Design an enzyme around this catalytic site. Structure first.
Site, PDB file in Angstrom:
ATOM      1  N   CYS A  23      -5.327   7.605   8.771  1.00 54.22           N
ATOM      2  CA  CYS A  23      -5.734   7.108  10.231  1.00 54.22           C
ATOM      3  C   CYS A  23      -5.392   8.503  11.099  1.00 54.22           C
ATOM      4  O   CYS A  23      -4.508   8.994  10.994  1.00 54.22           O
ATOM      5  CB  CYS A  23      -4.544   6.105  10.526  1.00 54.22           C
ATOM      6  SG  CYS A  23      -4.945   4.579   9.583  1.00 54.22           S
ATOM      7  N   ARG A  78      -8.736   0.176   3.115  1.00 60.71           N
ATOM      8  CA  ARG A  78      -7.691   1.182   3.035  1.00 60.71           C
ATOM      9  C   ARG A  78      -6.315   0.791   2.653  1.00 60.71           C
ATOM     10  O   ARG A  78      -5.498   1.065   1.801  1.00 60.71           O
ATOM     11  CB  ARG A  78      -7.669   2.470   3.793  1.00 60.71           C
ATOM     12  CG  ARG A  78      -8.675   3.275   3.933  1.00 60.71           C
ATOM     13  CD  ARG A  78      -8.331   4.420   5.011  1.00 60.71           C
ATOM     14  NE  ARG A  78      -7.213   5.112   4.322  1.00 60.71           N
ATOM     15  CZ  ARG A  78      -6.290   5.726   5.178  1.00 60.71           C
ATOM     16  NH1 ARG A  78      -6.168   5.543   6.476  1.00 60.71           N
ATOM     17  NH2 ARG A  78      -5.371   6.331   4.496  1.00 60.71           N
ATOM     18  N   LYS A 138       0.767  -1.237   0.049  1.00 61.05           N
ATOM     19  CA  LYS A 138       0.013   0.036  -0.006  1.00 61.05           C
ATOM     20  C   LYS A 138       0.952   1.226  -0.246  1.00 61.05           C
ATOM     21  O   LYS A 138       0.767   1.888  -0.771  1.00 61.05           O
ATOM     22  CB  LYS A 138      -0.875  -0.079   1.176  1.00 61.05           C
ATOM     23  CG  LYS A 138      -1.574   0.963   1.534  1.00 61.05           C
ATOM     24  CD  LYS A 138      -2.091   1.283   2.944  1.00 61.05           C
ATOM     25  CE  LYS A 138      -2.681   2.566   3.398  1.00 61.05           C
ATOM     26  NZ  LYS A 138      -2.058   3.663   3.323  1.00 61.05           N
ATOM     27  N   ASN A 139       1.872   1.037   0.714  1.00 62.21           N
ATOM     28  CA  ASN A 139       2.752   2.227   1.069  1.00 62.21           C
ATOM     29  C   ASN A 139       3.644   2.655   0.208  1.00 62.21           C
ATOM     30  O   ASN A 139       4.615   3.689   0.275  1.00 62.21           O
ATOM     31  CB  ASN A 139       3.017   2.451   2.472  1.00 62.21           C
ATOM     32  CG  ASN A 139       1.866   2.792   3.492  1.00 62.21           C
ATOM     33  OD1 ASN A 139       0.808   3.154   3.109  1.00 62.21           O
ATOM     34  ND2 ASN A 139       1.999   2.269   4.751  1.00 62.21           N
ATOM     35  N   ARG A 189      -0.596  14.375  13.051  1.00 54.91           N
ATOM     36  CA  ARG A 189       0.006  14.055  11.985  1.00 54.91           C
ATOM     37  C   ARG A 189       0.197  15.518  11.057  1.00 54.91           C
ATOM     38  O   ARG A 189      -0.106  15.658   9.935  1.00 54.91           O
ATOM     39  CB  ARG A 189      -0.792  13.178  11.074  1.00 54.91           C
ATOM     40  CG  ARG A 189      -0.812  11.799  11.872  1.00 54.91           C
ATOM     41  CD  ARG A 189      -1.673  10.761  11.005  1.00 54.91           C
ATOM     42  NE  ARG A 189      -0.863  10.328   9.916  1.00 54.91           N
ATOM     43  CZ  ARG A 189      -1.115   9.087   9.384  1.00 54.91           C
ATOM     44  NH1 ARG A 189      -2.294   8.481   9.256  1.00 54.91           N
ATOM     45  NH2 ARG A 189      -0.027   8.974   8.307  1.00 54.91           N
ATOM     46  N   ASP A 237       3.478   0.234  12.253  1.00 49.84           N
ATOM     47  CA  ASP A 237       2.390  -0.207  11.338  1.00 49.84           C
ATOM     48  C   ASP A 237       2.040  -1.377  11.861  1.00 49.84           C
ATOM     49  O   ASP A 237       1.185  -2.389  11.412  1.00 49.84           O
ATOM     50  CB  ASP A 237       2.584  -0.229   9.983  1.00 49.84           C
ATOM     51  CG  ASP A 237       2.153   1.254   9.208  1.00 49.84           C
ATOM     52  OD1 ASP A 237       1.497   1.853  10.238  1.00 49.84           O
ATOM     53  OD2 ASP A 237       2.376   1.403   8.057  1.00 49.84           O
TER      54      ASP A 237
HETATM   55  C1  UD1 Z   1       0.363   6.395   3.193  1.00 45.97           C
HETATM   56  C2  UD1 Z   1       1.804   5.934   4.169  1.00 45.97           C
HETATM   57  O1  UD1 Z   1       2.900   5.988   3.891  1.00 45.97           O
HETATM   58  N1  UD1 Z   1       1.601   5.906   5.551  1.00 45.97           N
HETATM   59  C3  UD1 Z   1       2.657   5.371   6.295  1.00 45.97           C
HETATM   60  C4  UD1 Z   1       3.573   6.554   6.696  1.00 45.97           C
HETATM   61  O2  UD1 Z   1       2.924   7.795   7.204  1.00 45.97           O
HETATM   62  P1  UD1 Z   1       3.594   9.213   7.141  1.00 45.97           P
HETATM   63  O3  UD1 Z   1       4.481   9.387   6.010  1.00 45.97           O
HETATM   64  O4  UD1 Z   1       2.421  10.048   7.573  1.00 45.97           O
HETATM   65  O5  UD1 Z   1       4.663   8.893   8.477  1.00 45.97           O
HETATM   66  P2  UD1 Z   1       5.606   9.798   9.205  1.00 45.97           P
HETATM   67  O6  UD1 Z   1       6.807   9.192   8.968  1.00 45.97           O
HETATM   68  O7  UD1 Z   1       6.029  11.187   8.142  1.00 45.97           O
HETATM   69  O8  UD1 Z   1       5.245  10.434  10.459  1.00 45.97           O
HETATM   70  C5  UD1 Z   1       6.080  10.062  11.468  1.00 45.97           C
HETATM   71  C6  UD1 Z   1       5.921  10.975  12.851  1.00 45.97           C
HETATM   72  O9  UD1 Z   1       6.523  11.984  12.313  1.00 45.97           O
HETATM   73  C7  UD1 Z   1       5.585  13.135  12.476  1.00 45.97           C
HETATM   74  N2  UD1 Z   1       5.545  14.086  11.259  1.00 45.97           N
HETATM   75  C8  UD1 Z   1       5.435  13.667  10.139  1.00 45.97           C
HETATM   76  C9  UD1 Z   1       5.501  14.540   9.130  1.00 45.97           C
HETATM   77  C10 UD1 Z   1       5.757  16.023   9.338  1.00 45.97           C
HETATM   78  O10 UD1 Z   1       5.681  16.597   8.183  1.00 45.97           O
HETATM   79  N3  UD1 Z   1       5.814  16.322  10.695  1.00 45.97           N
HETATM   80  C11 UD1 Z   1       5.806  15.642  11.538  1.00 45.97           C
HETATM   81  O11 UD1 Z   1       6.117  16.022  12.587  1.00 45.97           O
HETATM   82  C12 UD1 Z   1       4.255  12.464  12.610  1.00 45.97           C
HETATM   83  O12 UD1 Z   1       2.894  13.004  12.957  1.00 45.97           O
HETATM   84  C13 UD1 Z   1       4.726  11.207  13.361  1.00 45.97           C
HETATM   85  O13 UD1 Z   1       4.500  11.648  14.865  1.00 45.97           O
HETATM   86  O14 UD1 Z   1       4.644   6.118   7.315  1.00 45.97           O
HETATM   87  C14 UD1 Z   1       4.078   5.872   8.692  1.00 45.97           C
HETATM   88  C15 UD1 Z   1       5.273   5.574   9.833  1.00 45.97           C
HETATM   89  O15 UD1 Z   1       6.174   4.388   9.454  1.00 45.97           O
HETATM   90  C16 UD1 Z   1       2.983   4.587   8.627  1.00 45.97           C
HETATM   91  O16 UD1 Z   1       2.702   4.289   9.912  1.00 45.97           O
HETATM   92  C17 UD1 Z   1       2.155   4.953   7.576  1.00 45.97           C
HETATM   93  O17 UD1 Z   1       1.143   3.982   7.540  1.00 45.97           O
END
Ligand code: UD1
EC number: 2.5.1.7
Length: 419
Positions: A115, A397, A22-23, A120, A305
């Site tokens: 989610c 999803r 998915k990711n 986020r 995850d």
């Molecule tokens: C669609 C997809 O690929 N989803 C995955 C992706 O999500 P996602 O890309 O949202 O994961 P992130 O690694 O960015 O988030 C990790 C941490 O960083 C924080 N953060 C992130 C971005 C930002 O701009 N600022 C910030 O502070 C988050 O809110 C969280 O506390 O990686 C996550 C962590 O392996 C998975 O659990 C999600 O299923």
């Protein structure tokens, strides 16, 4: 509101064929906005997020279709504002921003959905694009980016590790003038897969999979054919299904090296695991798993995850085990639901303390997010009696045909439409 009615207990055992990640599929679909020639993406799972992404790309002006493989022709993309309804239903929509500004000089996307396991924010995506030269303004919930001419390569030291922001920066950098070096880059297998997809189109990227990614920008990207890697989370989910079932399973179309931490923890839980070039087998030899202590962290550490799933494993395992969630701040929503099924757990700050019980009892439970929904369905399979998981739309999803796949392993499950 669709629900899953599950009758347990049932021992889940047999085989399952893992679908594309998915990711990895999602960032690749959005990366295709950079492609100036048609692309064929193979092994793309049939998930709600993929459908949403295809509609989103189509509404931006790309020609999109699928079937087994997804085909995208983004040559004539001519709309740069992502539609609200499609953006708000998943996290992946944030990835439309970077490619739009990098290739067209502008992009507008509302804050993403997905989610609700934390606030986020997307500050790292914004900061990264700004460091590449984009001007960004946040107004009325929309992130609006623009640049006069091409982005310019920069040495970007990410002050927090982020899978999504690493993708945003890496993809946008492929069309920037000069070289971009991303430090503290996320190392997830999906980042490697996205990088290799970009390289197929003509991008110049190295270091993917490590904390330092180097991108040398090019004028334009072409097209290509690329097969998405196996879904490690779907794989871990089914391995956990077998573990808590005291059964055995063979996962086909798997990529063992994406799961070092998860497999090690399953061995610690007592699982007999073997791996091949493209498969993983787990056999409990009829034994109840042993509780394990887990701490989530970015790849290659144990993945957040898989946290909800291991919470379930610990709750039916022998002994007490804890799971410390360091990546998201609201990812214990499944705990109260499992407690309704007889689980014994206490939440202490960012850690859930689990005390395993021999068997759970069926109950009416509520899916709160993607991985939680899968965990509750698995709980239903091994629980005594009837379990009804509400709001199962969450599962669609990230899991392709989980109903069919679980049924093939021995599960008694029915998707009930409308209560
Ligand atoms: C669609 C997809 O690929 N989803 C995955 C992706 O999500 P996602 O890309 O949202 O994961 P992130 O690694 O960015 O988030 C990790 C941490 O960083 C924080 N953060 C992130 C971005 C930002 O701009 N600022 C910030 O502070 C988050 O809110 C969280 O506390 O990686 C996550 C962590 O392996 C998975 O659990 C999600 O299923």
């Amino acid at each position: 509101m669709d629900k899953f009615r599950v009758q347990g207990p049932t021992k889940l055992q047999g085989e399952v064929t893992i679908s594309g990640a998915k990711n990895a599929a999602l960032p690749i679909l959005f990366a295709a906005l950079l492609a100036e020639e048609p692309v064929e993406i193979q092994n793309v799972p049939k998930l709600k997020d993929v459908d949403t992404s295809m509609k989103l790309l189509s509404q931006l002006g790309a020609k999109v279709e699928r079937x087994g493989s997804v085909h995208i022709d983004a040559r004539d993309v001519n709309v740069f504002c992502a539609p609200y309804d499609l953006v708000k239903t998943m996290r992946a929509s944030i990835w439309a921003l970077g490619p739009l500004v990098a290739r067209f000089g502008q992009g507008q996307v509302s804050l993403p959905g997905g989610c609700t396991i934390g606030a986020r924010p997307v500050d790292l995506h914004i900061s990264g694009l700004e460091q590449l030269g984009a001007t960004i303004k946040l107004e009325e919930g929309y992130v609006k980016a623009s640049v006069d001419g091409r982005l310019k390569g920069a040495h970007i030291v990410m002050d927090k590790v982020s899978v999504g922001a690493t993708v945003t920066i890496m993809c946008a950098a492929t069309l920037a003038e000069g070289t971009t070096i991303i430090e503290n880059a996320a190392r997830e297998p999906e980042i490697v897969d996205t990088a290799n997809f970009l390289i197929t189109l003509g991008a110049k990227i190295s270091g993917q999979g490590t904390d330092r990614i180097v991108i040398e920008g090019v004028e334009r990207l072409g097209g290509g054919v690329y097969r998405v890697l196996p879904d490690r989370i779907e794989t871990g989910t089914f391995l956990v299904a077998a573990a808590i079932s005291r059964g055995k399973i063979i996962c086909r179309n798997a990529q063992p090296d994406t799961l070092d931490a998860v497999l090690a923890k399953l061995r610690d839980a007592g699982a007999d695991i073997e791996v091949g070039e493209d498969w993983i087998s787990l056999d409990m030899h009829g034994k109840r798993p042993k509780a394990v202590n887990v701490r989530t962290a970015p790849h290659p550490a144990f993945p957040t995850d898989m946290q909800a799933q291991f919470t379930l494993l610990n709750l039916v395992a022998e002994g007490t085990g804890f799971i410390t969630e360091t990546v998201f701040e609201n990812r214990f929503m499944h705990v109260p639901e499992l407690s309704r099924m007889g689980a014994h757990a206490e939440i202490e700050s960012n850690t859930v303390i689990c005390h395993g019980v021999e068997k759970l009892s069926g109950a009416q439970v509520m899916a709160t997010d993607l991985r939680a929904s899968a965990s509750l369905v698995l709980a239903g399979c091994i629980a005594e009696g009837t379990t009804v998981v509400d709001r199962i739309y969450h599962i669609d999803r990230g899991y392709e045909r989980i109903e069919d796949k679980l049924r093939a392993l021995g599960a008694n499950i029915e998707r009930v439409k409308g209560e």
